[PDB]
Amino acid sequence: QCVKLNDGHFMPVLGFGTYAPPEVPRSKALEVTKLAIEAGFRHIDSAHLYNNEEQVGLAIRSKIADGSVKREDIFYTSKLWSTFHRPELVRPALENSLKKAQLDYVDLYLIHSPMSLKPIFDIVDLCTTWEAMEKCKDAGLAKSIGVSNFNRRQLEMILNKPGLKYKPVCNQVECHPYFNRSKLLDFCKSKDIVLVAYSALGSQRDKRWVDPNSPVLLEDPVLCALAKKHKRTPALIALRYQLQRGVVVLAKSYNEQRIRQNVQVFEFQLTAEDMKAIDGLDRNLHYFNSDSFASHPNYPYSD
Ligand SMILES: NC(=O)c1ccc[n+]([C@@H]2O[C@H](COP(=O)([O-])OP(=O)(O)OC[C@H]3O[C@@H](n4cnc5c(N)ncnc54)[C@H](OP(=O)(O)O)[C@@H]3O)[C@@H](O)[C@H]2O)c1
Ligand SMILES: CC(C)Cc1ccc([C@@H](C)C(=O)O)cc1
After folding, report:
1. Full set of structural domains in the chain with CATH
2. What does 2-62 look like in DSSP terms, one character per residue?
3. Which atom of ligand 1 is closest in space to residue 113's alpha carbon?
4. 82 CB under 6 A from ligand 2?
């Protein structure tokens, strides 16, 4: 099903994550996005950074052309990369993503991160970036607009902006049982802003940003025990946990079996005791933990 966003548009609560590192041929994103839509995904998360918008857009267009879905049935997200925060660059970056995907509009456009980069760090007033985002929704380039990787204080900066026209509909952030974002999630709920979780399956553990020593979420003993109790899988437990918290959850998979397994999240439910057990795993662990983020003046986890 879908959640109703604070601008009246609807967002499907399970989304397909499309990122794969450069060693995976670009052609795979086309193939797996098609398999995701076939499996029943209707929300597809991409970004300029991911270098796959051509393939992902072609996958969406391919499934429209063969009669499987209509454009209105698909919720596509792209994101404004941090070198394009200066307000005059926002609409051209979005138009560029739309040209790559060959789509007339995105369902959702996010500021990918609060950490501005030289168009080397940059200093930009993100309220002016936001005004530029509001103009893209007014022009019909984006049905909805939101943010990503914002903390509470950064989110309040927007919410408190003089003459705000549109609240962010969502804040897409790292969120899983080792870093469950409870207090942020409560704040977002108090504002009717949806929290969308990425790395909900514990991340792709990419050596560029993730310490290989970090705990492997899907081997967690509590998640494994819950998967045995429910005769599901640790991944399904981890996705279902998000849905029952009122969090919209992404799941990346480039594997045909796991793509189809992931939509099973709608087929069972966790009890209050199960949810408390998963809540007990929280350990302030963000898998993305790299000098290249942590030294930035607007790093969100500076807390
Ligand atoms: N906003 C941001 O800054 C940001 C940052 C990170 C990610 N994201 C978005 O969120 C998406 C998902 O996050 P993520 O890329 O960190 O990955 P994820 O959803 O945490 O998945 C991690 C790994 O889980 C594996 N997996 C998937 N389904 C499984 C299953 N049923 N059983 C066992 N393993 C399973 C996948 O491997 P296989 O491919 O081998 O199945 C995947 O590499 C990204 O693709 C991107 O769209 C956004
Ligand atoms: C505070 C930082 C850690 C947030 C952040 C995480 C991942 C990304 C890119 C690499 C992505 O994969 O979408 C961008 C920003």
Report:
1. 1-303 (3.20.20.100)
2. EEE-TTS-EEESEEEE----TTS-HHHHHHHHHHHHHHT--EEE--GGGT-HHHHHHHHHH
3. 3
4. no
